[PDB]
Design a protein around this ligand. Structure first.
Ligand code: M7G
Ligand code: M7G
Ligand code: SAH
Ligand code: SAH
Lengths: 291, 291
């Protein structure tokens, strides 16, 4: 067995302290080990992101604009969680694809069947006015050409919507498929437990203070780094069994999930962080029909 | 006579401490009082900007890419000034219009007859590589539609060229001609002595540290402010005769010019700032054929 003792898991890209040469044969290995793993991946990251905003007092009263939301099964869990905590939020889920019917019939959630373009962003901005907007983006076109176009749309979402915070899908183009350098918004590169086995995807979390918008350039050298750091994390780290983690499941992803879940607010009072997390995890797995 | 005593002049937009309601009849008033006033306006601002970079030690060894440079008569003065000071710089002047022949025959200056587009910016970036670039932009299309397009090109100049510093033309669209909010690079809003009598134009000066790029949103309310602050400056301030300014010419613009010129480096040693400035001014006016 692949055992180890860890203090904490890597929460952000910058914390990864090692790298490995990407082995293309990794692409043929089992990408997922749990049913509905993708909904689980998104649920944890967005619960993490949103709980942070709650902590900073910027969630209550906001309209969450989620673009690239369908099917959005896991989003029903997020909505219930904050709704039950007393936080007042409106959800606007937009995708050209159809949403899970469990999202219908909630006055606080508006489903829109539309593929957004810059012009539409303008109309909804005029229509949301004057609410404070929190943007979540998971749009998907993939070539490096596709990625750049998605990233370009994500930056236009921020400039038109002008949100108070944002969570954006972020996967650096592969160095061997580099086209040109580009800019992404400045934010924390939140790592994702339960991401596919060798995925290099993370989420970019940002909070917008003032009327400024800070971007950061991404080059091929950065692309080389992303590949090696993420490859090291996926191949080595995520395959570890953290034996000094007293929890029903000690695999790295559960250890990593534990640290995100420990930041979530509940109505129920618990005697230990371990009890709250076990509760939230049980709750999350039951909702998603994960054994 | 319109007399007053002033400590210093307003160097940046933010310093303007008063405003006036824009009177449209001002548009019919004499816009210029000196021959070649436009070359003088550009010369002082760019001498100011470039001397600053020298002070920060980022000028020597740079390639100055000036887009919207023709005719560029005043640019010959700038080139000579730094060339004579021993600073090593290469100039690349690009405009679809033709440059003043006084700029020909200098190995350190390359004239390009081209209207730049994003693609061309890419090729020159590949060709300038690996020199450090200082961008100066004075491109001109004007409707608010024209402005936005120019500003959009200016931001693409920065993202493709990725300069160490930049000076950009900046005039906020008039509130009564507002189209949409937009972003401009963050920088100092340098005010311009000898600008047309009622011009609301200034120059945006920026220095790029790290791999980040900070932008700032401009709204109609900002547009209302620009109009009133600039109107107050043009109508009231610039019409002042600073009587406690011991200088051959006490009009506000000369007082303002004095503060920019006092920051310029010379080979000749002077006993007082007043002597250096008088020298630089005499020199500048003689070069431009201004009496
Ligand atoms: C993690 N990774 C994956 N691939 C390629 O990406 C293809 C699709 O797998 P993926 O990258 O997991 O898809 P996604 O990121 O769109 O969700 C695989 O078949 C590999 O060829 C990769 N190709 C390169 N060059 N470098 C990498 O780090 C890398
Ligand atoms: C300074 N100013 C000028 N204009 C208009 O701008 C026209 C051209 O004059 P300009 O603004 O000096 O041109 P420029 O900025 O392109 O160099 C004038 O005929 C006026 O109608 C202005 N119009 C408005 N609404 N507000 C202003 O502050 C203002
Ligand atoms: N312009 C656009 N506007 C809206 N959705 C977009 C888009 N372009 C692509 N997408 C959507 O991006 C999605 C990527 S998959 C998203 C999964 C979803 N976030 C979840 O919670 O289940 C697809 O449903 C796709 O239709
Ligand atoms: N795409 C582009 N590339 C180059 N020059 C441009 C441009 N679009 C407009 N311009 C130029 O912008 C200039 C504005 S007037 C500039 C005056 C000049 N800076 C001076 O020193 O004399 C015009 O010469 C015009 O041809």
């Amino acid at each position: 067995m692949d055992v180890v003792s860890l203090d904490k898991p890597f929460m952000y890209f910058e914390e990864i302290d090692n790298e490995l040469d990407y082995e293309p044969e990794s692409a043929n290995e089992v990408a997922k080990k749990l049913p509905y793993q993708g909904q689980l991946k998104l649920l944890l990251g967005e619960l993490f992101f949103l709980s942070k905003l709650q902590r900073h007092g910027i969630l209550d009263g906001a309209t969450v604009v989620y673009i690239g939301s369908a099917p959005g099964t896991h989003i029903r869990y997020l909505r219930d969680h904050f709704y039950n905590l007393g936080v007042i939020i409106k959800w606007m889920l937009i995708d050209g694809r159809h949403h899970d019917p469990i999202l219908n019939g909630l006055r606080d959630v508006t489903l829109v069947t539309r593929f957004v373009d810059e012009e539409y962003l303008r109309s909804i901005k005029k229509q949301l006015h004057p609410s404070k907007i929190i943007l979540i983006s998971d749009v998907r076109s993939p070539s490096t050409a596709d990625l750049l176009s998605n990233y370009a749309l994500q930056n236009v979402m921020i400039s038109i919507l002008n949100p108070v915070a944002s969570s954006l899908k972020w996967r650096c183009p592969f160095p061997d498929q580099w086209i040109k350098d580009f800019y992404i918004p400045h934010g924390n590169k939140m790592l994702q437990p339960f991401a596919p086995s060798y995925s290099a995807e993370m989420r970019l979390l940002s909070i917008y203070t003032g009327e400024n918008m800070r971007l950061t350039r991404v080059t091929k050298s950065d692309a080389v780094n992303y590949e090696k750091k993420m490859y090291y994390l996926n191949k080595i780290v995520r395959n570890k069994v953290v034996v000094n983690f007293d929890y029903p499941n000690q695999e790295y992803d559960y250890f990593h999930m534990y640290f995100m879940l420990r930041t979530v607010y509940c109505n129920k009072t618990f005697p230990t962080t371990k009890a709250k997390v076990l509760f939230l995890q049980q709750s999350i797995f039951r909702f998603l029909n994960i054994p």
